[PDB]
Amino acid sequence: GCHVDSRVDHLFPPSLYIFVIGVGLPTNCLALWAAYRQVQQRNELGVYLMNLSIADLLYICTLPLWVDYFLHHDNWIHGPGSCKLFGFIFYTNIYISIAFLCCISVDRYLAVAHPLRFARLRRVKTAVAVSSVVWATELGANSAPLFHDELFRDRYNHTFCFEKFPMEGWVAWMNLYRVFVGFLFPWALMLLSYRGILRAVRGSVSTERQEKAKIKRLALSLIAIVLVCFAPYHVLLLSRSAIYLGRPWDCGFEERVFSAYHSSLAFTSLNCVADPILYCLVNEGARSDVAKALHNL
């Protein structure tokens, strides 16, 4: 028993998702190939980039069903079953991607800020082990929606998928975990790792001032894109959880920010477009590899 009249919940999310699919699929495939090249050269950073590309590819694969759901004004009719699987993928790959971004940041921090050390933690085998642990933890930690009902039809025409208004207590605590452990904690680790990388780079003499400025701009760009993409949705999620725990029966806030909520959820999908650009297509080596792969293709 809550409204929704996101009058722009049928124009912005579907068009943005169409653009995301169309641009990400080639860029993400090329990024996956470049990460495969990096793994071939015994570089562990290719493992984390490869896993990030895999997660983004799964997100883009599940996206068109959400485009059809949004085009029917929040009506998902595929089944009880595809709702659960595809919504789980859709709502979990954001956190898998942020976990692997934090893994990339910490790996770069170990390589740059602490060279000549931690060579054991800088192998492909340990990268694969860390990736497996990250995957298992993220799927296990985000497994609560799999064990509950995934599809709810309200009094009105539209039927939701993984959402419900008013929301539930268990999903409230789940959202608190996602905001504070799923997103805020890995983002804090990314910020600390890139701050350490910047300090170490400023402590170096081989790199010129222009290269240091370029590195600082790239790191700030990574942090800022992650925050801009993932901040509105998580802030609205935390707000919804806070008012639901505070007074459940006063859904005047659910109707007040329903359109902004779905708009922010759609905006979060731009991270799987930014990642191939920010991790493969901005540096010369990966762009050259992608180039060799396309000309040979």
What features would you describe in this structure?
With 297 residues, the protein is an all-alpha fold. The protein has one domain (12-296): Rhopdopsin 7-helix transmembrane proteins (Up-down Bundle). The chain has helices at residues 12-40, 45-71, 80-112, 124-141, 169-202, 209-246, 253-256, 258-267, 271-281, 284-296, and strands spanning 151-153, 159-161. Strands 1-2 form a two-stranded antiparallel sheet. Strand 1 (151-153) and strand 2 (159-161) form a beta hairpin. Helix 1 crosses helix 10, helix 2 (45-71) packs antiparallel against helix 3 and helix 3 packs parallel to helix 5 (169-202). The termini are far apart.
Task: Please render the helix and strand layout as text.
Layout: H1 12-40, H2 45-71, H3 80-112, H4 124-141, E1 151-153, E2 159-161, H5 169-202, H6 209-246, H7 253-256, H8 258-267, H9 271-281, H10 284-296
Antiparallel strand pairs: 1-2
Family: Belongs to the G-protein coupled receptor 1 family.
Membrane topology: Multi-pass membrane protein
Disulfide bonds: 2-251, 83-161
CATH architecture heading? Up-down Bundle
From the alpha-carbon coordinates, what is the Rg to the nearest angstrom? 20 Å
CATH topology: Rhopdopsin 7-helix transmembrane proteins
Q: Order of strands across the widest beta sheet?
A: 1-2
Beta-strand segment tally = 2
What's the main sheet like?
Answer: 2 strands, antiparallel
Number of domains: 1
Disulfide bonds: 2-251, 83-161
Transmembrane segments: 2-38, 43-73, 79-114, 123-149, 166-203, 208-243, 254-282
Site (Proton sensing): 148, 158, 262
Extracellular side: 74-78, 150-165, 244-253
